[PDB]
Design a protein around this ligand. Structure first.
Ligand SMILES: *[C@@H]1O[C@H](CO)[C@@H](O[C@@H]2O[C@H](CO)[C@@H](O[C@@H]3O[C@H](CO)[C@@H](O)[C@H](O)[C@@H]3O)[C@H](O)[C@H]2NC(C)=O)[C@H](O)[C@H]1NC(C)=O
Ligand SMILES: *[C@@H]1O[C@H](CO)[C@@H](O[C@@H]2O[C@H](CO)[C@@H](O)[C@H](O)[C@H]2NC(C)=O)[C@H](O)[C@H]1NC(C)=O
Lengths: 49, 49
């Protein structure tokens, strides 16, 4: 059994596409969104009260 | 009855920083960084006197 063989198979191993769990990216937090104002309504109303 | 007060509040200004606004609604048209020698690079529109 040493006479050897022939590997005639043409390899076409295509790797599967890996799974991707997309992140819920957040650029500005809610604190920055509330702090991005020259005038805040809650502060004005509290001062008036 | 005469009473003098000294209130210490927080004021907010947004870029380009050409006016600030205290929490009590004191809208001031003076740049918070105008030091009296950089009027060309900072706004000032309140009364001069
Ligand atoms: C009032 O604020 C203005 C800016 O709005 C000041 O002008 C700036 O002052 C700085 C600090 O001296 C200057 O920086 C200096 O620049 C040179 C390089 O040119 C260097 O030799 C120093 O190490 C230093 O960093 C700056 O050039 C100057 N101008 C601008 C357009 O930014 C002004 O000095 C302030 N006045 C007072 C009385 O505080
Ligand atoms: C005063 O500020 C203005 C703009 O804020 C400066 O005008 C700029 O001048 C530079 C250099 O001459 C130009 O490249 C810019 O295009 C100009 N910008 C504008 C909006 O005009 C002016 O030079 C400043 N004066 C000073 C520093 O004496």
């Amino acid at each position: 059994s040493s006479i050897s063989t022939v590997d005639s198979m043409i390899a076409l191993d295509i790797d599967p596409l890996e799974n991707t769990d997309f992140r819920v990216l957040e650029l500005y937090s809610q604190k920055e969104l509330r702090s991005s104002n020259v005038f805040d309504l809650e502060e004005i109303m509290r001062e008036f009260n | 009855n005469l009473n003098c007060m000294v209130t210490i509040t927080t004021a907010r200004s947004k870029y380009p920083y050409h006016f600030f606004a205290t929490s009590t609604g004191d809208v001031v048209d003076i740049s918070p960084f105008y030091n009296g020698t950089n009027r060309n690079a900072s706004y000032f529109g309140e009364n001069a006197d």
